[PDB]
Amino acid sequence: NPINYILGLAIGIASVGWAMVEIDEEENPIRLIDLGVRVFERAEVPKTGDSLAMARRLARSVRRLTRRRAHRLLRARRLLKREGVLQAADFDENGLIKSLPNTPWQLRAAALDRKLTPLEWSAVLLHLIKHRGYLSQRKNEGETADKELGALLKGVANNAHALQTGDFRTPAELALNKFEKESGHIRNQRGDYSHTFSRKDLQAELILLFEKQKEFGNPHVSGGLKEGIETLLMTQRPALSGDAVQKMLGHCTFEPAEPKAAKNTYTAERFIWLTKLNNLRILEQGSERPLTDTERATLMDEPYRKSKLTYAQARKLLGLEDTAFFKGLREASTLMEMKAYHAISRALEKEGLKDKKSPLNLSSELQDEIGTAFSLFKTDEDITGRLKDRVQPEILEALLKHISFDKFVQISLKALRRIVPLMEQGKRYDEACAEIYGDHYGKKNTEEKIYLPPIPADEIRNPVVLRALSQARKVINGVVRRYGSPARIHIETAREVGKSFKDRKEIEDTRYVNRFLCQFVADHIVFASNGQITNLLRGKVRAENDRHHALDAVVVACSTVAMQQKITRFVRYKTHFPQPWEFFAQEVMIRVFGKPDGKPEFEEADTPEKLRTLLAEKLPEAVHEYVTPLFVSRAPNRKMSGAHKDTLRSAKRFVKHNEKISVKRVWLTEIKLADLENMVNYKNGREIELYEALKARLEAYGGNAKQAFDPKDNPFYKKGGQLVKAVRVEKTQESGVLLNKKNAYTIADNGDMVRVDVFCKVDKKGKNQYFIVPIYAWQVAENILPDIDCKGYRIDDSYTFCFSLHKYDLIAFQKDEKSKVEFAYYINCDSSNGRFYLAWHDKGSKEQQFRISTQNLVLIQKYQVNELGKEIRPCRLKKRPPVR
RNA sequence: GGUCACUCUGCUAUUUAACUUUACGUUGUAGCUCCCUUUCUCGAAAGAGAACCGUUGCUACAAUAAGGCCGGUGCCGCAACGCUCUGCCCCUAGGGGCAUCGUUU
DNA sequence: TAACTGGGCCTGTAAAGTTAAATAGCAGAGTGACC
DNA sequence: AGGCCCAGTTA
Numbered sequence A: 001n002p003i004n005y006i007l008g009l010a011i012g013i014a015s016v017g018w019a020m021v022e023i024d025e026e027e028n029p030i031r032l033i034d035l036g037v038r039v040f041e042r043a044e045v046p047k048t049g050d051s052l053a054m055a056r057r058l059a060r061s062v063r064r065l066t067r068r069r070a071h072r073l074l075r076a077r078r079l080l081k082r083e084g085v086l087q088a089a090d091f092d093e094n095g096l097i098k099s100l101p102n103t104p105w106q107l108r109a110a111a112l113d114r115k116l117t118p119l120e121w122s123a124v125l126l127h128l129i130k131h132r133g134y135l136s137q138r139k140n141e142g143e144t145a146d147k148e149l150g151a152l153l154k155g156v157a158n159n160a161h162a163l164q165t166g167d168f169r170t171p172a173e174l175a176l177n178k179f180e181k182e183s184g185h186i187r188n189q190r191g192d193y194s195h196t197f198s199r200k201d202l203q204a205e206l207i208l209l210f211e212k213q214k215e216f217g218n219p220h221v222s223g224g225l226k227e228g229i230e231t232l233l234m235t236q237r238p239a240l241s242g243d244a245v246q247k248m249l250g251h252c253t254f255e256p257a258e259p260k261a262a263k264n265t266y267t268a269e270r271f272i273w274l275t276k277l278n279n280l281r282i283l284e285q286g287s288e289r290p291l292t293d294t295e296r297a298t299l300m301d302e303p304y305r306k307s308k309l310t311y312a313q314a315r316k317l318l319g320l321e322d323t324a325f326f327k328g329l330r331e332a333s334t335l336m337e338m339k340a341y342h343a344i345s346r347a348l349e350k351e352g353l354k355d356k357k358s359p360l361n362l363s364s365e366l367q368d369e370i371g372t373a374f375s376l377f378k379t380d381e382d383i384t385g386r387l388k389d390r391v392q393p394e395i396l397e398a399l400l401k402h403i404s405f406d407k408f409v410q411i412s413l414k415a416l417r418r419i420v421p422l423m424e425q426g427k428r429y430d431e432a433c434a435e436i437y438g439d440h441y442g443k444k445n446t447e448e449k450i451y452l453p454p455i456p457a458d459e460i461r462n463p464v465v466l467r468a469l470s471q472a473r474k475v476i477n478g479v480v481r482r483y484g485s486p487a488r489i490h491i492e493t494a495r496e497v498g499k500s501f502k503d504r505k506e507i508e509d510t511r512y513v514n515r516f517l518c519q520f521v522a523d524h525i526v527f528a529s530n531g532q533i534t535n536l537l538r539g540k541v542r543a544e545n546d547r548h549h550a551l552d553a554v555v556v557a558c559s560t561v562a563m564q565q566k567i568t569r570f571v572r573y574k575t576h577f578p579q580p581w582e583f584f585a586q587e588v589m590i591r592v593f594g595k596p597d598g599k600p601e602f603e604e605a606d607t608p609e610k611l612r613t614l615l616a617e618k619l620p621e622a623v624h625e626y627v628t629p630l631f632v633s634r635a636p637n638r639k640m641s642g643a644h645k646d647t648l649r650s651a652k653r654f655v656k657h658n659e660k661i662s663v664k665r666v667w668l669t670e671i672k673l674a675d676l677e678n679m680v681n682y683k684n685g686r687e688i689e690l691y692e693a694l695k696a697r698l699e700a701y702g703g704n705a706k707q708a709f710d711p712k713d714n715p716f717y718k719k720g721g722q723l724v725k726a727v728r729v730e731k732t733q734e735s736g737v738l739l740n741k742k743n744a745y746t747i748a749d750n751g752d753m754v755r756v757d758v759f760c761k762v763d764k765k766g767k768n769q770y771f772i773v774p775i776y777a778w779q780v781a782e783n784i785l786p787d788i789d790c791k792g793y794r795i796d797d798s799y800t801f802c803f804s805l806h807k808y809d810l811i812a813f814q815k816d817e818k819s820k821v822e823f824a825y826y827i828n829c830d831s832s833n834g835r836f837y838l839a840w841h842d843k844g845s846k847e848q849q850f851r852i853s854t855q856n857l858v859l860i861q862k863y864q865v866n867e868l869g870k871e872i873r874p875c876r877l878k879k880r881p882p883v884r
Numbered sequence B: 001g002g003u004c005a006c007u008c009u010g011c012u013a014u015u016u017a018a019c020u021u022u023a024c025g026u027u028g029u030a031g032c033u034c035c036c037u038u039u040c041u042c043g044a045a046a047g048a049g050a051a052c053c054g055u056u057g058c059u060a061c062a063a064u065a066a067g068g069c070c071g072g073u074g075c076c077g078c079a080a081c082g083c084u085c086u087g088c089c090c091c092u093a094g095g096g097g098c099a100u101c102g103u104u105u
Numbered sequence C: 001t002a003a004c005t006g007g008g009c010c011t012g013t014a015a016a017g018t019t020a021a022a023t024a025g026c027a028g029a030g031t032g033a034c035c
Numbered sequence D: 001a002g003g004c005c006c007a008g009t010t011a
Helices: A052-082 A104-110 A118-130 A151-164 A171-183 A199-215 A223-234 A266-278 A293-300 A311-317 A339-350 A364-376 A380-387 A393-402 A413-425 A429-437 A463-483 A501-507 A517-524 A548-556 A562-572 A587-593 A608-616 A652-656 A673-677 A688-700 A777-782
Strands: A009-011 A015-023 A029-039 A260-262 A408-412 A648-650 A661-667 A726-732 A737-739 A746-748 A753-761 A769-776 A800-805 A810-813 A824-829 A836-839 A851-853 A861-863 A865-867 A871-873
Touching: A009 A463, A009 A548, A015 A463, A015 A548, A029 A463, A029 A548, A029 A587, A052 A118, A052 A223, A104 A118, A104 A171, A118 A199, A118 A223, A151 A171, A151 A199, A171 A199, A199 A223, A260 A266, A260 A364, A266 A293, A266 A339, A266 A364, A266 A408, A266 A413, A293 A311, A339 A364, A339 A393, A364 A380, A380 A393, A408 A413, A413 A429, A463 A517, A548 A587, A587 A608, A652 A661, A673 A688, A673 A726, A753 A824, A769 A777, A800 A861, A810 A824
Parallel strands: none
Antiparallel strands: A009 A015, A015 A029, A260 A408, A648 A661, A648 A746, A661 A726, A737 A746, A753 A769, A753 A800, A810 A861, A824 A836, A836 A851, A865 A871
């Protein structure tokens, strides 16, 4: 099996591809061999550009929030029962309070003046616990500039200031006189923050109430009840706990199994100091010069004595005035800050055993330990658990009172302890590294294999580029595992593939430019091509990616020569760089498209034999049987995960009387004429005059609902004087998802179809009718297998099972009794008509390059297998797979 | 000497991953409230007055994935990656592919 | 009265913190490989 | 972009 490969691969954000070539003795390729292109599912939400895992993280966060709030209210009700406020006869079967009042603001205001019923008192407590305001929970240090206070902070601070004035005693009293004043309502509406309170003010109201209801003879003012309610109001789970920081740390440079040193460590701060000092060889007298040993020793230990050793103090300590020095800094801005030592010193001088002018002292190892503790942990529990019986209790209490460390450095404490004395002597960082670790300091151990392994867990930041590198490794290994190891493959990352979705939309080498790809390919196995000069080699060209990756591939296969040499020379500051060779300038255009030949309108060479024979008769001995008509390979998605749509709609009629409609309120600002036509009180004829008034108000502005119905400029009023901010509108709901089935009639649109199972049947008039059934994620969660085919009737035993498929799986095409074979790729399916969206070997821009097809009478639709760059086999399945 | 790349430090900008909360929004149920369909009752008429349902606004409460686990204030569940355990599909005992399998947990 | 077909509508959101990591720009120190 | 309905047309 003779083999030779310098093939060449070109990658992009939405596609990768490769084209093979036969090489000779030295750096010269003969005729090409084979090509194949894979496409991508861009790893980001298409329109927004958000990460796919970002929505998952937000869903997890809101799940946790909702669940913890529910359980906090449950604990509140259990405490209400225990402390004797309410008895078991006051709780229903679901644990809720019977006849619980719905006026907690008025009751919170009246509790300042009168006695409260146990029901009123329980309602007030539950209302204070459920709506508890915002907690600052940020670093207590600050300055005299707060410019970025947004809407939430502005509202909270304004309400707090209005509560600190001598007119309103409590937040509920202020809420009642803002309810009446201008808002008309109490809470926030339409994403506003004007009415939110600080949790400190709500805690103050809770304490003051408890005191007042102690004055007025409320029987339930127990200390246990007060402590429980205050704990339920104030307690929050910590943001960082345990190894949360440790699991997020990088790896030390030289020391293999050692964690990074904290930036606020003694050793690390002295290391930064010595780095600055020894690399400060910057004194310009017309020529630079280092600092002598006596100069360094004199200036070194001043940052401990004073607060900040700035450049002015440095000059005033030793130097002159004419050889200005102080390299490439062009005032004197602090030059160094011993922030860890100075911060510990001022914290201990605040309350502890310390004097202001006197210099403080502690074991350098203990300083290291406390820095590491405050960087790796934030809760007092974990910090004490790490520093108990390592430090004294009083100084530990002071440190927990006023110390907080955040950042880290790139090298461990062990390597730092080995390195910093060599810098104290005067040696440079690289000198110490070469002296200690023998100038190697990292062993690639280049286990060059034929197959390329994947990347590790902490691969890179960008998930789009992570997926790019993963599928690039896949496509490279697929060809290396069957065509031998390549000599000078190809490299090709587009300027847009690198990074910057937002800049990508602005455009419609500042990127993660192969820093993990170049290293990976160079170690575990090449030609570094440049997309700018990758269009160059003599040979637009149908920008729509039928084979748009193939040209980039064949030319990334040709970048190893003086072209790149004087390209680097032109990057340094050359006119001609042609490389015409092998007389395939138009043969490649013939092969990669299939039927291009400069004709631009001709039947595709969709057959192997036909393609080879026709190219043999086109512009002789360059024909190689190891080729097949090229078509793109789709990365398929078979994930069974997904979620239903977030919008909740009424479904009382849908389940009780089985009319296929949902009802949802629509704001008058986002309303349209069709919504008015689907008003609940209009289509049943309840409120015709209101409908006519709304229609007139909309038509007066020609459909501009944001301007016709605008608060504070054009409010709408019903007959009688009641405001209308939204109206219930009916929508057609053929299929849905029932939610909260125990306590309500609520539905949500299906969303996230995971797969489609297609059955085929005969016996109407000797013809084949196909029925297609959808399967969504919620059905997989509920473990059900549907039997209704999108418009069709039930699936009985008569219908024989034919197959099932997911997105991007290819199938076969009839389109009629007598037509062409038309292999295509699934994209979507229609829940109403059963239609299919499809795309063929053309890149398939979903906006315009779509194809629509209905499926009831197609006379042939078949499952297919479309593995690597071109390895298409026919797959057949006969056992209907279930869902769990 | 220039070009590129790499290690370390400082500052800046952007991006990514994890976690803690708040305020909304949506649906439902109550209560008060704006309209209003229908059906009745009292009326000899005029006129009143009730009731279900719909529904405007405000307040409260509930739900806010659907669902999996298992030796309670419990862990997961809209993502990515991979072939060590399984299935499917595929290709020649060997090898791939895709997962409903596993990992980040 | 049932399919086919082009058009077109609706889709969950903002704000406040604790962290870690990745890319790029500038300044400072060095290394190595090419031109 | 996914989901899928709407009004017209066609067999």
